[PDB]
């Protein structure tokens, strides 16, 4: 079976551009440098050992390993990994057609050992309204998915089912059409919108939990996810001008006919009614 | 030549979406008080007096000097954010259509005060703040609503809006000839609804002697699509003041879209934006 093809960080944007197109996903190997890797790794740790909050929890009340919205507890997210130049090289040639993208959600699963595999899915399910836009449309969506810790077949590897983003249901594949995403920490897998994928699980023994950082850049015309509303002005205007259109601190602009822009009140950028400075302001 | 259903502010509702269904617009009659009415314009002649910039004006700047423009009625009009946002025939409406998408809420609410001489405007669809509506199907569970509010009296002369009824099944927008389109000839007081889709336009204002035009539009759009507004700079005091209703409309509060998304959306820290907050509001 055709693998999961994988390129060097500095590959061709346009290659990627037509990976994505025709198997829908692609490995960039070593992306991120270890020390990345392990301060990000260090500071998820120190979340993890967060006591447990008296309170409801929405994905996690809902549960009997889960880490949400990482840019504002991680500020390696935030600061390196959310900016790196390779990935929003990757958006802006993916979005094209669509216009300005924003980070509609970055949180961490931990799969321990004993941990079941994941269910086939595509990334659809938070804008129920991608269901139905039709192959040829602006994609709006595309996967970013770190590998934290090695991603193997025993520990439960990412599966994606390539090219199949051409099917209009995923209906129930078997686990063997797809293909693994095998990984050293510090890589990346991109995953295009409507392509069929699964987490592994950790079928192993020994106590090693795999970890993995999603996150979701969305059109600038879907609704984030996570509200990054609440982050504290201070840790904000440490932040990039890329960084904070990431967050959705300021306005953004869909490609046209919208030809005014979005995220904006008092017929004002929203970093000028605040006042906003960044660090590259 | 067929024209728009005017119906009662008591009217059921399935009748409202019906039309909505084959039409694609009708008008209420009479949904607001004139007391409403007269302090909205009041709290917008307040607005209006304002010399307006300084420099950047983002959808202003956009569009010919055919009217004048009043962004975000919300954060600077009472009556609409405490009587009108929150009215329960609106609500009742958008429930019903948005059946399938789940939580909606407000991506903008503006005026447009259109004066004497000026030309009509182009047969639109109100699909441009988010592109990716083109797209979806007819058939497809809608994300959008137009709420069409008149503060004066809408007339042939004046240039009450043109809708082209049947529009949304159209492939194309295309090239519309005037005559298509059926006037909503109004009171202030009454209300069009023009679902997702539908080509239209506000008229030219031909007349020689009164007071402009007002127009106030409201669009309601499932919770995935992203505001052209952002309320988020609302004061606290102001924003408590508000009801449940009203919060879940300006981006206050976490929404949950239908299944499959069984979590929601706008939340944060994997809890209720509201919690988070500590968020009072007026009626809870
Ligand atoms: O656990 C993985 O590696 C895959 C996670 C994933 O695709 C998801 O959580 O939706
Ligand atoms: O409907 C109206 O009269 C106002 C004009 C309009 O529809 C718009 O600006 O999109
Ligand atoms: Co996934
Ligand atoms: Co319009």
Not at 18 to 45: M, Q, W
Not at 122 to 149: C, G, K, N, W
Not at 163 to 175: A, D, I, K, L, M
Request: hydrophobic share 40%; glycine share 6%; aromatic share 8%.
């Amino acid at each position: 079976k055709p693998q999961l093809q994988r390129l060097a960080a500095d590959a061709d944007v346009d290659r990627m551009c037509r990976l994505l197109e025709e198997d829908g996903a692609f490995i960039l190997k070593g992306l991120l440098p270890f020390d990345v890797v392990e301060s990000f790794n260090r500071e998820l740790d120190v979340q993890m050992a967060i006591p447990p909050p008296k309170g409801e929890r929405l994905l996690a009340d809902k549960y009997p390993k889960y880490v949400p919205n990482v840019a504002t507890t991680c500020p390696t997210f935030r600061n390196t990994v959310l900016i790196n130049p390779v990935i929003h090289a990757i958006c802006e040639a993916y979005f094209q057609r669509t216009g300005d993208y924003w980070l509609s959600a970055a949180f961490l699963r931990e799969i321990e050992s004993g941990m079941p595999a994941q269910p086939f899915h595509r990334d659809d399910a938070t804008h129920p309204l991608m269901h139905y836009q039709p192959l040829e449309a602006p994609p709006v969506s595309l996967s970013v998915i770190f590998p934290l810790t090695e991603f193997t077949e025993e520990n439960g590897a990412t599966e994606v089912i390539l090219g199949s983003h051409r099917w209009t249901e995923v209906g129930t594949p078997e686990r063997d059409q797809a293909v693994l995403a095998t990984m050293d920490p510090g890589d990346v897998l991109i995953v295009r919108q409507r392509v069929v994928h699964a987490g592994g699980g950790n079928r192993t023994t020994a106590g090693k939990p795999r970890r993995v950082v999603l996150a979701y850049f969305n059109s600038v015309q879907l609704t984030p996810f996570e509200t990054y509303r609440t982050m504290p002005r201070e840790m904000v205007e440490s932040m990039t001008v890329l960084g904070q259109r990431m967050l959705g601190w300021r306005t953004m602009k869909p490609s046209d006919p919208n030809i005014v822009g979005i995220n904006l009140i008092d017929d004002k950028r929203l970093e000028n009614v605040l006042q906003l400075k960044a660090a590259d302001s």
